Amino acid sequence: SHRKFSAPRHGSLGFLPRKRSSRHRGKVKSFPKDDPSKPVHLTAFLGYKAGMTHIVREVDRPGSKVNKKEVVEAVTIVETPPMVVVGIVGYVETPRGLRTFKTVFAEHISDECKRRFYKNWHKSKKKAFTKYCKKWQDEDGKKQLEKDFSSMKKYCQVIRVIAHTQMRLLPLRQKKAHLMEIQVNGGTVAEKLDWARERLEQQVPVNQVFGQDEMIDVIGVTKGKGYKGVTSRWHTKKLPRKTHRGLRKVACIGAWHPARVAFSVARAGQKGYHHRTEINKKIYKIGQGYLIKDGKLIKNNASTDYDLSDKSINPLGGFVHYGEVTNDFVMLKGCVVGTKKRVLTLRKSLLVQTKRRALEKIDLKFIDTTSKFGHGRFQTMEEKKAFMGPLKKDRIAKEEGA
Amino acid sequence: MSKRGRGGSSGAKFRISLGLPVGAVINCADNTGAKNLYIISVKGIKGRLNRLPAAGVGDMVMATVKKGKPELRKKVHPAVVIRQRKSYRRKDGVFLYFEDNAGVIVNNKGEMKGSAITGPVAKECADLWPRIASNAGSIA
RNA sequence: ACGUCGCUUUUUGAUCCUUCGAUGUCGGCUCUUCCUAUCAUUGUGAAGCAGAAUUCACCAAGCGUUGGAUUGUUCACCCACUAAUAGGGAACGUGAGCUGGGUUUAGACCGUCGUGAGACAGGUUAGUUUUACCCUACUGAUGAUGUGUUGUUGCCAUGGUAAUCCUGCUCAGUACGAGAGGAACCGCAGGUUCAGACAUUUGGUGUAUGUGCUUGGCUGAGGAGCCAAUGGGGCGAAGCUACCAUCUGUGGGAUUAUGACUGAACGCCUCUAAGUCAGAAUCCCGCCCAGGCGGAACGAUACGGCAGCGCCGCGGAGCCU
RNA sequence: GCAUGAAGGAUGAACGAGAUUCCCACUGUCCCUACCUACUAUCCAGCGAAACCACAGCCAAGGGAACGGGCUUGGCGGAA
RNA sequence: CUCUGGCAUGUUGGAACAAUGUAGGUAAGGGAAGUCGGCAAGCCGGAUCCGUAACUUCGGGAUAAGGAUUGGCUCUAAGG
RNA sequence: GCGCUGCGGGAUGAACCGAACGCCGGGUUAAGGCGCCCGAUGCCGACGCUCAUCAGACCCCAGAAAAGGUGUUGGUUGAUAUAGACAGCAGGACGGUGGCCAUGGAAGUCGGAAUCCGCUAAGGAGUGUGUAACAACUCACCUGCCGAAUCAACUAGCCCU
RNA sequence: CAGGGCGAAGCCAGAGGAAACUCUGGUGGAGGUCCGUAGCGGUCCUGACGUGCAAAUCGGUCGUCCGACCUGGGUAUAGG
Ligand SMILES: COc1ccc(C[C@H]2NC[C@H](O)[C@H]2OC(C)=O)cc1
Ligand SMILES: [K+]
Ligand SMILES: [K+]
Ligand SMILES: [K+]
Ligand SMILES: [K+]
Ligand SMILES: [K+]
Ligand SMILES: [K+]
Ligand SMILES: [Mg+2]
Ligand SMILES: [Mg+2]
Ligand SMILES: [Mg+2]
Ligand SMILES: [Mg+2]
Ligand SMILES: [Mg+2]
Ligand SMILES: [Mg+2]
Ligand SMILES: [Mg+2]
Ligand SMILES: [Mg+2]
Ligand SMILES: [Mg+2]
Ligand SMILES: [Mg+2]
Ligand SMILES: [Mg+2]
Ligand SMILES: [Mg+2]
Ligand SMILES: [Mg+2]
Ligand SMILES: [Mg+2]
Ligand SMILES: [Mg+2]
Ligand SMILES: [Mg+2]
Ligand SMILES: [Mg+2]
Ligand SMILES: [Mg+2]
Ligand SMILES: [Mg+2]
Ligand SMILES: [Mg+2]
Ligand SMILES: [Mg+2]
Ligand SMILES: [Mg+2]
Ligand SMILES: [Mg+2]
Ligand SMILES: [Mg+2]
Ligand SMILES: [Mg+2]
Ligand SMILES: [Mg+2]
Ligand SMILES: [Mg+2]
Ligand SMILES: [Mg+2]
Ligand SMILES: [Mg+2]
Ligand SMILES: [Mg+2]
Ligand SMILES: [Mg+2]
Ligand SMILES: [Mg+2]
Ligand SMILES: [Mg+2]
Ligand SMILES: [Mg+2]
Ligand SMILES: [Mg+2]
Ligand SMILES: [Mg+2]
Ligand SMILES: [Mg+2]
Ligand SMILES: [Mg+2]
Ligand SMILES: [Mg+2]
Ligand SMILES: [Mg+2]
Numbered sequence A: 001s002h003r004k005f006s007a008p009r010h011g012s013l014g015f016l017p018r019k020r021s022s023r024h025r026g027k028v029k030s031f032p033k034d035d036p037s038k039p040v041h042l043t044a045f046l047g048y049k050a051g052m053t054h055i056v057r058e059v060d061r062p063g064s065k066v067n068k069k070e071v072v073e074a075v076t077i078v079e080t081p082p083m084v085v086v087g088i089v090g091y092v093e094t095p096r097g098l099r100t101f102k103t104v105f106a107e108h109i110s111d112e113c114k115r116r117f118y119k120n121w122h123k124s125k126k127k128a129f130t131k132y133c134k135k136w137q138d139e140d141g142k143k144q145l146e147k148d149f150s151s152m153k154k155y156c157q158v159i160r161v162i163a164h165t166q167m168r169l170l171p172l173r174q175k176k177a178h179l180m181e182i183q184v185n186g187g188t189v190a191e192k193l194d195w196a197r198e199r200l201e202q203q204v205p206v207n208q209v210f211g212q213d214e215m216i217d218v219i220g221v222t223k224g225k226g227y228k229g230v231t232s233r234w235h236t237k238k239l240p241r242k243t244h245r246g247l248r249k250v251a252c253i254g255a256w257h258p259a260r261v262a263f264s265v266a267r268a269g270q271k272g273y274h275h276r277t278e279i280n281k282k283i284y285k286i287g288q289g290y291l292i293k294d295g296k297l298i299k300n301n302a303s304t305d306y307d308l309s310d311k312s313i314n315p316l317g318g319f320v321h322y323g324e325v326t327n328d329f330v331m332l333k334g335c336v337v338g339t340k341k342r343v344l345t346l347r348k349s350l351l352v353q354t355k356r357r358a359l360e361k362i363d364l365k366f367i368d369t370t371s372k373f374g375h376g377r378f379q380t381m382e383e384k385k386a387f388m389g390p391l392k393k394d395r396i397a398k399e400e401g402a
Numbered sequence B: 001m002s003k004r005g006r007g008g009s010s011g012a013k014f015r016i017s018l019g020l021p022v023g024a025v026i027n028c029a030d031n032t033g034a035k036n037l038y039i040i041s042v043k044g045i046k047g048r049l050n051r052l053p054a055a056g057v058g059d060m061v062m063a064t065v066k067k068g069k070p071e072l073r074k075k076v077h078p079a080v081v082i083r084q085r086k087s088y089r090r091k092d093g094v095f096l097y098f099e100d101n102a103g104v105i106v107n108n109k110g111e112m113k114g115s116a117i118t119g120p121v122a123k124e125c126a127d128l129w130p131r132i133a134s135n136a137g138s139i140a
Numbered sequence C: 001a002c003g004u005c006g007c008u009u010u011u012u013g014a015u016c017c018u019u020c021g022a023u024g025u026c027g028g029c030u031c032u033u034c035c036u037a038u039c040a041u042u043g044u045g046a047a048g049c050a051g052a053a054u055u056c057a058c059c060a061a062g063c064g065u066u067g068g069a070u071u072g073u074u075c076a077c078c079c080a081c082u083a084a085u086a087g088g089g090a091a092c093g094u095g096a097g098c099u100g101g102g103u104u105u106a107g108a109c110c111g112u113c114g115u116g117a118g119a120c121a122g123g124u125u126a127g128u129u130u131u132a133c134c135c136u137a138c139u140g141a142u143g144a145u146g147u148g149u150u151g152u153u154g155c156c157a158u159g160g161u162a163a164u165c166c167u168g169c170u171c172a173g174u175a176c177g178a179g180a181g182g183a184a185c186c187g188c189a190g191g192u193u194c195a196g197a198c199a200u201u202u203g204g205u206g207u208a209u210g211u212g213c214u215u216g217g218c219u220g221a222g223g224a225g226c227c228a229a230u231g232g233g234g235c236g237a238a239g240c241u242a243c244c245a246u247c248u249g250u251g252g253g254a255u256u257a258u259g260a261c262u263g264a265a266c267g268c269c270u271c272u273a274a275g276u277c278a279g280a281a282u283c284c285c286g287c288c289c290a291g292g293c294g295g296a297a298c299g300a301u302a303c304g305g306c307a308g309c310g311c312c313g314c315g316g317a318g319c320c321u
Numbered sequence D: 001g002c003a004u005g006a007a008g009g010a011u012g013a014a015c016g017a018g019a020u021u022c023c024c025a026c027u028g029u030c031c032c033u034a035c036c037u038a039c040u041a042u043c044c045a046g047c048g049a050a051a052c053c054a055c056a057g058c059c060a061a062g063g064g065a066a067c068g069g070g071c072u073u074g075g076c077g078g079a080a
Numbered sequence E: 001c002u003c004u005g006g007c008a009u010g011u012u013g014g015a016a017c018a019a020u021g022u023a024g025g026u027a028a029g030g031g032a033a034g035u036c037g038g039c040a041a042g043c044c045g046g047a048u049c050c051g052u053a054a055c056u057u058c059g060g061g062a063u064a065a066g067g068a069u070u071g072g073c074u075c076u077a078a079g080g
Numbered sequence F: 001g002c003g004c005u006g007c008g009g010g011a012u013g014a015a016c017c018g019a020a021c022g023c024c025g026g027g028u029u030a031a032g033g034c035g036c037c038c039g040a041u042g043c044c045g046a047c048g049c050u051c052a053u054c055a056g057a058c059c060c061c062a063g064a065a066a067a068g069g070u071g072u073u074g075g076u077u078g079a080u081a082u083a084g085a086c087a088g089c090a091g092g093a094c095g096g097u098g099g100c101c102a103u104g105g106a107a108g109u110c111g112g113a114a115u116c117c118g119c120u121a122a123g124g125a126g127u128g129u130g131u132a133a134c135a136a137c138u139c140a141c142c143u144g145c146c147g148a149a150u151c152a153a154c155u156a157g158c159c160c161u
Numbered sequence G: 001c002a003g004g005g006c007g008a009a010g011c012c013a014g015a016g017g018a019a020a021c022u023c024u025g026g027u028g029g030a031g032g033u034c035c036g037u038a039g040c041g042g043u044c045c046u047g048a049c050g051u052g053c054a055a056a057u058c059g060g061u062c063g064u065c066c067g068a069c070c071u072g073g074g075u076a077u078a079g080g
């Protein structure tokens, strides 16, 4: 008989199976559609989730109760040191899909990128690309590479650059670089190859891929939770306390007929560590990395036009379980998938941004830098000393010194 | 936006944590002679299976007077929550909460049955109901 | 209306074919899926449709259909909210899922009946709810399986699929209407219900057994500690986590109903016959999740042993299959 | 008054692990679920049963003793 | 909790800290809206001083209900 | 007849259709079939009927009725027509009389019965709209333009609702 | 068969009264008395277990706990 009262189903069947992701790095399942009219440009970038703080900004939203009023908005800090282009890959449109036509790598490959090719770098001889690189010097190789570039020019319709992160600039134990293919949109295919050939072995900053006030998508692997019951995995109603045999369950996993458990019924298993693609994450700030100017170190990337404090995006005491953000970063509104230190794929929007929220221009007024390793009380090292004054350790240090 | 009548505001109330589910007995903060309001239903709630309708400041509810003047008892009144003890986040990041849960008896037009309000009235409630804000002593 | 033709198995009967070396009985609860004879929501046609509201009908099951008082209740009835609070199936779906209120063993009470033992679709009270480690199904987990080995980067066959409804503002107190009343599209700000995250912030947790306080005892005492199955309590990092905080949720195509164009059949007419157009919460795809006993491109390919290997010389024979 | 009623009728203070209704206080009973601890479960070394068992084990429809794992016609089927 | 006396954790040990359990605990705001039913849990709790209703077989009800106080230290007075 | 019975066909099936059975070869059939599964039409098969945005498709047998269609195909009974039909484009549609009764109103047109006559090409005791009644429009009937077939009812095949 | 609560009769003193008697304080220590151990029992979680530690057990919570109390041994009653 019919269920007495109507109720929505628990969970979405569009995210099945709820299995551990086959990949750790976020995968761009679809790149933005190519408009040859647009200038040649990359469509994606790789970043690392450092942590989250909150900001203060004035909202220009006519007709809203927060119009010309200041609000506090949580933001996520994604460390994005420049990526190095080490290869070009061409694709041909076939009646069976897109087929990898030809791959051409640059002459010089860093040990960061070369680590990606080895399960045990320590025990290896690091021979990868040692014979390939000679093609760029030998006369026979130079002609062969030029044949590849011309064939890619003549037959490929999709051109992508193979780029890798610089793990040496990040405060992580990992030194193996995450490599990914980034599609090159805009222009003709000939212009795509000319543009990509120049960028070979070069660095690409994040501000050449993304801009301020841009709605972008974040692709990555959610935080793993291990083996979970239906109550946590699918958020099914807990059974009464009197329930024998346990209550963190689903009572009826199906009718008598059909005589099989259906795929739509909530079951226990893996939760988290699922590949996901969240969209419309607005870029609030593209921060600059630490810079050395005429002898001194410039690190006031957390200063706004209204808070001229010389402080970095790093909270007092550093980002918890991540480290110190010294490279370029992107400040994204709201939260994103993944743990701290998780590599995130930043992709341009597949949609046309015309809503007022998407077209909003963000002007920051304050960036919170209080410690997140407890109840943060002071924005900077300086004002903590100014407020508290000298301590016992300070007296002893000045006593020992003089 | 549960409020359903002409005379509303271009700006719309943002979502607030609701701490007062049906069954909540809240104080009556006006001079009608009622001492408390017993919620029986929140206006605008569609809800789901098993979820008790719940209200926050600014929410019109239907309530019965459990103790107070006898002619106010044994009948259903439209009431508006003006104070709640559940802390709720404003858009400027302030987690505000009051000492008590309080309401005032009104009619369907939003006009207030009493004449004075004891204690402060939340800013969210005051903006949504002009008549209540008019009788308020302080707006928190 | 008088008549009359049907459909359904959501009632009850009729029957007794299956089950008595046993298919666990009512109801609820939980959960999934399905049907449409559509309550709402999308697109429409008709009115005794001025507007608003309402009624009838079509495409239509994508999505939603709630919180309680009494009752074991299915069913009822009322309170209240709502866009609406539609109707049904799945062994009267769902007891090694639960619960056990009812029914339906043994105790007992009352009324009626009986000489009695006892009986009672009359009422009442108390009354053990067993087993999965097997196969499959399902959920996750490893692995097998192309390509010599191995790795990196990818493609997409196919399977899944998701968003929903409301309110206020503007339009506008306008069209319409004598008046009362009273719309709509575009635009704007939000919210419900769902989905997928996340922990900066607020809240929850807390055996960092972190740091104070404290009872009884114990180490002669101070100091430092310990025991009391976490002694108790305050505050509490990290981590986890809550519409109890916060973020994000999307574009095409052919078309249905219908309304039409050109236009015969039928010198007229006609949306249809040939031809053509507009067209929607449906459908299909995209986005998104997985990734074939399915492919692709690219890298490196085994040494002091005289070893392992590749390629050529359509080099020489012979072998097994 | 279906079918109350007098050795049992009617009533009782006190008592009750007796049946019922309401109110206060109280709470995770619930909204709505989260986290923590112990012991398991989990993996390992040693040790090591039982129930049960025609043969077995993927479905849809069909027909059939009128609800099939096997039969028919399709969907399909890949070690451990 | 300790001494005398006794014992080696109740027929095993190691590693880990998933789900579901069994046992214990806490939970914002609400407060029985859960459920057949407040089942379970929670609230209360000792002592001192106050204050104690209906009813009653005058014995009770009664720790009714309700309220305050409570440590440490230094003293004062009293009771042989 | 099944039970007691296999075998060919009916996909499948106790009963249906053919046919009943020692172990085989050749030949031929029955019922039933011959696009492919799957033996056989791989015939230059014959004559039609039918288009389905739920087509239809073989005894038992495994889905449907009343009712309807200006789909189409036949067939039946009438009617008009080269003295001019049907369609279309235009004019007349008159007098008695506002026929009788009835009705407050009833003048063709609320109702019941009569439903006749000079006047022509025709005009009614009216097929409808319309009015309190009128009026008015309009229909049959008939004429101008036109130049070959056309109109009405019914019936039953497939298809559709 | 811990430790506590309530405080029957009897008794003492004081006060009032013409008397009958009354009032107040104390003493006393009764009861199939109350709270609650050991013991005895077995309410509820319809908790654990439910091929169990166990062919009825375990945990929390409970009933009673000077009496119609609990209990050893001896003895009597024997299948319609
Ligand atoms: C009146 O309601 C009921 C009457 C009988 C039964 C049991 C029977 N049903 C089918 C079987 O014959 C038998 O199942 C068993 C296990 O004995 C159940 C409910
Ligand atoms: K049901
Ligand atoms: K509701
Ligand atoms: K039976
Ligand atoms: K502590
Ligand atoms: K009792
Ligand atoms: K209750
Ligand atoms: Mg339903
Ligand atoms: Mg793709
Ligand atoms: Mg139970
Ligand atoms: Mg922190
Ligand atoms: Mg419920
Ligand atoms: Mg503040
Ligand atoms: Mg009838
Ligand atoms: Mg039967
Ligand atoms: Mg059985
Ligand atoms: Mg059986
Ligand atoms: Mg069974
Ligand atoms: Mg129920
Ligand atoms: Mg329909
Ligand atoms: Mg559906
Ligand atoms: Mg009930
Ligand atoms: Mg059933
Ligand atoms: Mg059942
Ligand atoms: Mg059972
Ligand atoms: Mg079952
Ligand atoms: Mg029972
Ligand atoms: Mg009985
Ligand atoms: Mg009985
Ligand atoms: Mg009976
Ligand atoms: Mg009973
Ligand atoms: Mg009992
Ligand atoms: Mg199990
Ligand atoms: Mg196991
Ligand atoms: Mg915390
Ligand atoms: Mg000390
Ligand atoms: Mg010790
Ligand atoms: Mg705390
Ligand atoms: Mg939330
Ligand atoms: Mg279209
Ligand atoms: Mg036309
Ligand atoms: Mg059409
Ligand atoms: Mg079109
Ligand atoms: Mg009698
Ligand atoms: Mg009697
Ligand atoms: Mg008596
Ligand atoms: Mg089947």
Ligand SMILES: [Mg+2]
Pocket (backbone or CB within 6 Å): D067
């Ligand atoms: Mg059946």
Ligand SMILES: [Mg+2]
Pocket (backbone or CB within 6 Å): none
């Ligand atoms: Mg079987």
Ligand SMILES: [Mg+2]
Pocket (backbone or CB within 6 Å): D071
């Ligand atoms: Mg067979």
Ligand SMILES: [Mg+2]
Pocket (backbone or CB within 6 Å): E009
């Ligand atoms: Mg132990």
Ligand SMILES: [Mg+2]
Pocket (backbone or CB within 6 Å): none
């Ligand atoms: Mg041991």
Ligand SMILES: [Mg+2]
Pocket (backbone or CB within 6 Å): E010
């Ligand atoms: Mg032992």
Ligand SMILES: [Mg+2]
Pocket (backbone or CB within 6 Å): E026
């Ligand atoms: Mg705590």
Ligand SMILES: [Mg+2]
Pocket (backbone or CB within 6 Å): E027
């Ligand atoms: Mg709480």
Ligand SMILES: [Mg+2]
Pocket (backbone or CB within 6 Å): none
């Ligand atoms: Mg609280």
Ligand SMILES: [Mg+2]
Pocket (backbone or CB within 6 Å): E031
């Ligand atoms: Mg309360």
Ligand SMILES: [Mg+2]
Pocket (backbone or CB within 6 Å): none
């Ligand atoms: Mg209830």
Ligand SMILES: [Mg+2]
Pocket (backbone or CB within 6 Å): none
């Ligand atoms: Mg209920």
Ligand SMILES: [Mg+2]
Pocket (backbone or CB within 6 Å): none
């Ligand atoms: Mg209890």
Ligand SMILES: [Mg+2]
Pocket (backbone or CB within 6 Å): E064
């Ligand atoms: Mg009492």
Ligand SMILES: [Mg+2]
Pocket (backbone or CB within 6 Å): none
């Ligand atoms: Mg026989």
Ligand SMILES: [Mg+2]
Pocket (backbone or CB within 6 Å): none
């Ligand atoms: Mg015979």
